[PDB]
Design a protein around this ligand. Structure first.
Ligand code: PWG
Ligand code: PWG
Ligand code: CL
Ligand code: MG
Ligand code: MG
Ligand code: MG
Ligand code: MG
Lengths: 194, 194
């Protein structure tokens, strides 16, 4: 019933552009929308996000998260490890690479989502969500070495999976951080499964 | 130790703008970023709300109520939590109950309300509250519920059992061209991982 008629460039930066989208509404009326896209997609999706489950014997299972300054937010955010997929990179390879660069952890693919939308009211941005387990008892994960890219500055925050939502609420309360919506959504469903 | 130095407008639409963000990196060095923001954010604690609507009915499994809409930015149909922008002077809780009734017909009861969480913090300043609402599907109000879609709003309601959410989403994606929202996928993944 609905579809794109045309896109008009409003403004293109190096990494992001603003388009004016003309589309057919399901009554047969023509309508316009202001749409954000990345200029970087070549790719099943723009990015991967990694759900990293740190498994250590005789410890609570943890979810490994990252804290970073986010210039669009003007502040620090708590997020799943994540990055853009390199041209010709698989989502799985991107996941293990981003997880190792951001956390220094070496993990195993458990499962990989299809492309899922980040904010479909505003952007065409998509990611693969990639569930990875980390054998925290293996020697390679003893002293995990975070290898940042140029300009990346990442703090690792491991939180017990069984209390994730309460732990995130605490950090926000004490640390004035913004929690990522996908991290918060995961933490909610862990509580709601009960 | 990182902070914003300046925000230079690049391009302002009616609904979205692109900014050149200048910030201090943690080595004491000036860098820039391309940042997306909405033009619509006034005194709201966030741009929007997304609703996690748990439909509860005697001798039924709990359903998660989802909506399917054409999203011009994506050029296609997306499956999302009911969601909308917070009106000037509207509370996140009132926005969530209003958007839930407008998009699905269902009259919910507030359960919980997140702090402001970031939609895509590497790209935008966009934030939502994630509001968990229970719907009493035994109430006569919620019997044959009628969406009240706004102007140029066309929403289909999809209620899926919480206990099978991820496989039910996977089956919808296998049967037509559509994108699942990243927050819905993150929530369905955590239900499986619990
Ligand atoms: F920011 C973009 F998402 C965007 N572009 N158009 C809109 C509208 C409009 F009513 F104009 F269609 C409402 C809300 C957001 N919009
Ligand atoms: F698209 C915007 F999110 C955006 N602005 N700058 C960047 C960079 C840069 F390396 F330049 F810093 C990398 C990735 C995305 N960026
Ligand atoms: Cl798992
Ligand atoms: Mg990253
Ligand atoms: Mg990285
Ligand atoms: Mg909406
Ligand atoms: Mg609406």
């Amino acid at each position: 019933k609905q579809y794109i008629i045309s896109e008009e460039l409003i403004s293109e930066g190096k990494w992001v552009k603003l388009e004016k989208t003309t589309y057919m509404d399901p009554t047969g009326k023509t309508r316009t929308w202001e749409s954000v896209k990345r200029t970087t997609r070549k790719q099943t999706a723009d990015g991967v996000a990694v759900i990293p489950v740190l498994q250590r014997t005789l410890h609570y299972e943890c979810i490994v998260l990252v804290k970073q300054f986010r210039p669009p937010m003007g502040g620090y955010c708590i997020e799943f490890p994540a990055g853009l997929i390199d041209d010709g990179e698989t989502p799985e390879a991107a996941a293990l690479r981003e997880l190792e660069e951001e956390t220094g952890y070496k993990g195993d693919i458990a499962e990989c989502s299809p492309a899922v939308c980040m904010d479909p009211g505003l952007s065409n941005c998509t990611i693969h969500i990639v569930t990875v387990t980390i054998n925290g008892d293996d020697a390679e994960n003893a002293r995990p070495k975070p290898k940042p890219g140029d300009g990346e500055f990442v703090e690792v925050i491991s939180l017990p999976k069984n209390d994730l939502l309460q732990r995130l609420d605490a950090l926000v309360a004490e640390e004035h951080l913004t929690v990522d919506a996908r991290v918060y959504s995961y933490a909610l469903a862990l509580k709601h499964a009960n």
